[PDB]
Structure formats: structure tokens, C-alpha cells
Amino acid sequence: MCLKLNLLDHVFANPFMNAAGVLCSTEEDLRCMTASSSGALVSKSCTSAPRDGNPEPRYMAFPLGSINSMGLPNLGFDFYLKYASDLHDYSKKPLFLSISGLSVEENVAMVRRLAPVAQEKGVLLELNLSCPNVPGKPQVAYDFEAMRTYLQQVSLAYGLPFGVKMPPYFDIAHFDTAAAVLNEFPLVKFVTCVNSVGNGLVIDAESESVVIKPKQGFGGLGGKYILPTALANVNAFYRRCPDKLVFGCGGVYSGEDAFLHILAGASMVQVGTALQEEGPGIFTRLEDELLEIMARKGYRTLEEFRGRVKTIE
Amino acid sequence: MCLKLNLLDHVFANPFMNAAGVLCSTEEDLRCMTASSSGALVSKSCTSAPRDGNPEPRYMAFPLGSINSMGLPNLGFDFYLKYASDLHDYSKKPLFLSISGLSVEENVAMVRRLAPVAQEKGVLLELNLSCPNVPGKPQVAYDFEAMRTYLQQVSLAYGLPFGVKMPPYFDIAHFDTAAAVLNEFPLVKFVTCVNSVGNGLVIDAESESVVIKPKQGFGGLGGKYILPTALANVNAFYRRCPDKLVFGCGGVYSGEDAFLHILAGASMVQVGTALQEEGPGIFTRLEDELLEIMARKGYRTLEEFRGRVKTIE
Ligand SMILES: Cc1cc2nc3c(=O)[nH]c(=O)nc-3n(C[C@H](O)[C@H](O)[C@H](O)COP(=O)(O)O)c2cc1C
Numbered sequence A, B: 001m002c003l004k005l006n007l008l009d010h011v012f013a014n015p016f017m018n019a020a021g022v023l024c025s026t027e028e029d030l031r032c033m034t035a036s037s038s039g040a041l042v043s044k045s046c047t048s049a050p051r052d053g054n055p056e057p058r059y060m061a062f063p064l065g066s067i068n069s070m071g072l073p074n075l076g077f078d079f080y081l082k083y084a085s086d087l088h089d090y091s092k093k094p095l096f097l098s099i100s101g102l103s104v105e106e107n108v109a110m111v112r113r114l115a116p117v118a119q120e121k122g123v124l125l126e127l128n129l130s131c132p133n134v135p136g137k138p139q140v141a142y143d144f145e146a147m148r149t150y151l152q153q154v155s156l157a158y159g160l161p162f163g164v165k166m167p168p169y170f171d172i173a174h175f176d177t178a179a180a181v182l183n184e185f186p187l188v189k190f191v192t193c194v195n196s197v198g199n200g201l202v203i204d205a206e207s208e209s210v211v212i213k214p215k216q217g218f219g220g221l222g223g224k225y226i227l228p229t230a231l232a233n234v235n236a237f238y239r240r241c242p243d244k245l246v247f248g249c250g251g252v253y254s255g256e257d258a259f260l261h262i263l264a265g266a267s268m269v270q271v272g273t274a275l276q277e278e279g280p281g282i283f284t285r286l287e288d289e290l291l292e293i294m295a296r297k298g299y300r301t302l303e304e305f306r307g308r309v310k311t312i313e
């Protein structure tokens, strides 16, 4: 069996890709993600100018997942745009470029320059409205008026299809309001659920200390901690945005976890923590494992089960 | 070495208690919690009238924690008020009564009647502003104006010290606004962080189905999934409400987990999912394991290390 999508006017070998931020900051990283067996890749969220990010240590991993307060360390938008315009081999797989300006004006400045390169090369924008780790800059999509202003200004400056990286929500009223805001914007063609679960705190019992330096230890959680939260958000936006695509991210370590994301409604499945820990070999194991679960169940296509999670009664 | 605490004008043999909702709905449950080695107990959140709750199955547990959408099944306020007034043995340990009216008016009606029993017997109110499982009733403490109204009306009607069971937050701005609202109310003497992490979705891969029946499978998460979220909220409100107590709840399975809660600022430590799974024998184990950690570190009392989590740099 082989794993075939035609999403967003592109073709993908399989639904897997890295999650933004993981294995995608430098040219070396992007060449490594391009050489891997993933179906696509996305760049590190960038800002207009290069950033060194927050002080180290700023990432730690544990058996149940990871915590991070990277603080958008990146080579600057000029680098990621050059990689998309001049360096990426689009014959290998599609590229998404993630942007995370610290203001609506900074996002609008980057998308105005991205648009010609999207027209010429077909790079796909993922607009990050959910960074939880820049001091004093709360997650934009937890302020629904700020979210609306960002999506209005980016849709008018960019003028092309794009997607949005969403924070997790935990309240049904918030799922209803956030999806209604998204559905105001016909240029939003995909919704990535979820970014890290913000502002958790890991403490080491032996040393009686937090494990990361920024923000007194507070950072975003990924990995096994967050799978049922990620699944809920994937499904909630798949139910409420029937004319958009949902990309799943959060807690994928196995082909079975990917199967659950796709059953909840995911079109692509992004891999963060587990890719950071295992490296890019993970993508051959996740495709093998997903194909094996499909064969055991008699599924021949992703479409046969995407979004077909069953409810009781 | 000593687990004793003296707070809120009561003495507690040790910091452990059930989390509201677990092993506390019937008279039998409350007698069992009283017979256990816990330092205190809290009753199931109640409403004015008895409720049957949401349809079954409505709780499921797994190796990394639990999901529930119980729907406030309870024997009604009259029952829990009579247990507090006539049945509980206060010589064995202190009792908290949790109330979760579905409107401000319902809460006010109950606290008007509780006040004379609190004055006479010393039962302590825990006001639940965070139930994530009654369809159409979003968590009250995710609407800061609703939270201030409830606290104003309950403070005026009740007139006595009480505490609040808070939802988890994921955003530094929310920690700052929530604690500022609580700090407007001098009768709020303790803050219990956290209730379940709302509206997660567990899916069984084999059956391709959600595992609980209410709300299309969406329910609150407890257990191993939520410990770093619980520790962040305990510490965030510990640091922001220096004139109140913080009670920790979320992810406690071991004495080490309780140690981390207490390092983060917890006074009492409540146990939900792991007490639902293990039963009330867990309190002797958590006590032994916390005293073992204290012995190895040279700590003789809880106040030698409560709130003393170290940050880097
Ligand atoms: C080291 C690290 C850096 C990340 N940087 C970004 C980022 O630049 N942009 C972004 O949208 N999400 C970023 N995230 C969040 C991930 O894309 C993903 O949403 C989150 O880690 C959850 O997926 P997981 O459970 O597979 O880790 C980052 C996560 C990690 C661990």
C-alpha cells in the first residue's frame, strides 16, 4: 500500500512532517528534513530580524514529553525566505514556512515579501498565533479580537491561501468562538492543532529546581502529556471548520498515535517532541506503523477513516 | 519528622485529602474517607437539587491518567449539609464541602444555608468555579467578569472564609488577571489548583471510538497527563497570592509528586485519579513516601521546603 494526498494544490508521499521548530532552524536542518522520508517539512517560526532566543537551558525532555521556552531563536525571515526561493528542492517534497512576528505589523511585513515567492515556488504559509514563550507576549489566539485583527491584516497583505498554528483550547465556548473567527477568513485553508500546551512547569525533585532557565521555569509542554488535548482540538476544529483542512500536532510517537489524529480529522500529522528525541529516522517507522494498522483493519486509503472517530450512542 | 499542618484554624495530621468528586458522593464514601489515613476530606461538588449526572460510560482510566464527564451527579445540597451538620466526626479530621451551583444564584442560595453550619461545626467551603463537564455551562473562572460576580455574591452572602477550586490556565496574562481577581476578595483564604484539564478526547484505536459517552467523548483530564500543568498553576498562584494558601491538585501518584507540589507552594495536596484507581490505602503510601524523601533531605517539617522551588540563575 502507499500513503497519497493531494492537499492545497500539492502532492504529498505521506501525511507526516516535522512540527515547526523541530529540526528546521538552519540550512543543515532543512536539508536533513528534506532528505528524510517525511511527506513535507516546515521551517522554524521566524521573525523579521534574527533572534538568539531565551537563555539556556531552554529545552528538556522526559519519558512523558518535553518542556521548552526557546523564545523564537531563528536566523531571521530573510534566511527562511531565501531557503524557500533559492535553496529548497520542491521535487523532493512541499515546504511550509512558519512566521511568528511579535506584532501584527511584523507579520504583515513578512507576508508581503513571502507572497511573490509563494506565487513563484508554491511555498505554503503557516502563521503562528500560538507561541507561549516570548516574555510579555501572550498567545495571540487566546485574545479573539487580536486573532481577528491578525487574520484580517495578514489576509489583506498576503492575498493567498495560508494556514494557522493554533494554541490548544480547553473550553467548548472557546472552540466555538475560535472556529467562528477562522471561518470568517476564506484564505485560511488549514488549521494546525496544536502548539505546545503553554506555561507548564517541570521540577526536578533531587535538585528542588525548575529544569529550564527562562520565565522561572515556565514553558510549553509537548509529547505524551498532550495527546488527548491535541486529539480534542483536532476533532473540535474538524467538526467546526468543515470547509478547511486540519493538521494534527501533539503527542505523536507511533503510527497508532498518527492513526488516532487522522481518525479525529487530521490531514497532515506533525511530529515535534518525538522527532527531537529520536531524529529523522522516526519518519520511516511512523509510516511503517501506520501502514501496518491500516492493513490489519482493511483500510486502503487515509480518506476511508479520516474524521471517522465514532461516538457512543 | 512531621507531616502536621495548622491552617485555617484547623489542625491536619498530614497534607493529603481526596480531590473533590473522588470517593465522596455518598455517606458510605465519606465514612470511608474519614476512616482513611488522609489528613482531611472534601465532599462531592453539589447542586441545590440531587442530579443523576451525564450518561454512562462517563469515567475511564488509563496508564497516563483519566478522562471524565461525570456531570455533577450528587445527592443534593441538603444531604451534604446534613452530613456536615450531623454525621461527620470532626474529631477524626476536618471536612471541606464543595459546592458547584450552575448559576450565581444557586451558589448564593446554598452558601446562605451553609453559613450557620460552618460557624457551628467548622466545615470549610470550597467553591467550584471550574467544572468542565456540564453541557452548555463553560468553566466560570475562564470568564473573569463572571468569576468576579460569583466571588462578590458569594462573599456578601456567606461572610465567612472560603476557598476556590480553579481551572488550569496556560497563559501568563491569565495567571496575572485570575490572581488579581482573587486578591480582591479577602474572604478567599485558599485557592485549589487545579481542576481537570478540560475537554480532552481519548480515542481507542482498536474500536475507533471515543471512550466516554457525554459530549461526543470530550471530558476533563486528570492524572499523569497534567502534573506539570498542575505544578505551574500551584506555583503561579503561590507567587501571585502571597496572603492566601494554595492547595495543590493534579497528577499526584507518589510522595515525590506531593513533594513537588509542596515545593511549588502547596499546603494541602489533593489526590483524584490515583485515589480513584488505587483506593484509600494510597494515603498511607503517600505519607510513607513523602516522609522518606524528607528524611533523605534532612527536612523535618513541610514549611521547611513549601514554596522553596529553586529557579535558575
Ligand atoms: C524545541 C521546540 C521548538 C518549537 N518551536 C516552535 C515554533 O518555532 N513554531 C511553532 O509553531 N511551534 C513550535 N513548537 C511547538 C511544536 O511545533 C508542537 O506544536 C508541540 O511541540 C507539540 O507537538 P509534540 O507533542 O509532537 O511535541 C516547538 C516545540 C519544541 C519542542
Ligand SMILES: Cc1cc2nc3c(=O)[nH]c(=O)nc-3n(C[C@H](O)[C@H](O)[C@H](O)COP(=O)(O)O)c2cc1C
Pocket (backbone or CB within 6 Å): B019, B020, B021, B022, B044, B045, B059, B066, B068, B070, B072, B098, B128, B165, B194, B195, B196, B221, B222, B223, B224, B226, B249, B250, B251, B252, B270, B271, B272, B273, B274, B276
Ligand atoms: C471522577 C471525577 C469526579 C470529579 N468531580 C469533581 C467535583 O465534583 N468537583 C471538583 O472540584 N473536581 C472534580 N474532579 C476534579 C478533581 O477534583 C481533580 O481536580 C482532577 O481530577 C485533577 O486531579 P488528579 O490529576 O489527581 O485526577 C473530578 C475528577 C474525577 C476524576
Ligand SMILES: O=C(O)c1[nH]c(=O)[nH]c(=O)c1F
Pocket (backbone or CB within 6 Å): A021, A045, A068, A069, A070, A071, A072, A073, A100, A128, A130, A131, A132, A133, A134, A195, A196, A220
Ligand atoms: O520558539 C519557541 O519558544 C516556541 N516554542 C513552542 O513550543 N511554540 C512556539 O510557537 C514557539 F515559537
Ligand SMILES: O=C(O)c1[nH]c(=O)[nH]c(=O)c1F
Pocket (backbone or CB within 6 Å): B021, B045, B068, B069, B070, B071, B072, B073, B100, B128, B130, B131, B132, B133, B134, B195, B196, B220
Ligand atoms: O462532575 C463532574 O463532571 C466534574 N468533573 C471534573 O473533572 N471536575 C468537576 O469540577 C466536576 F464537577
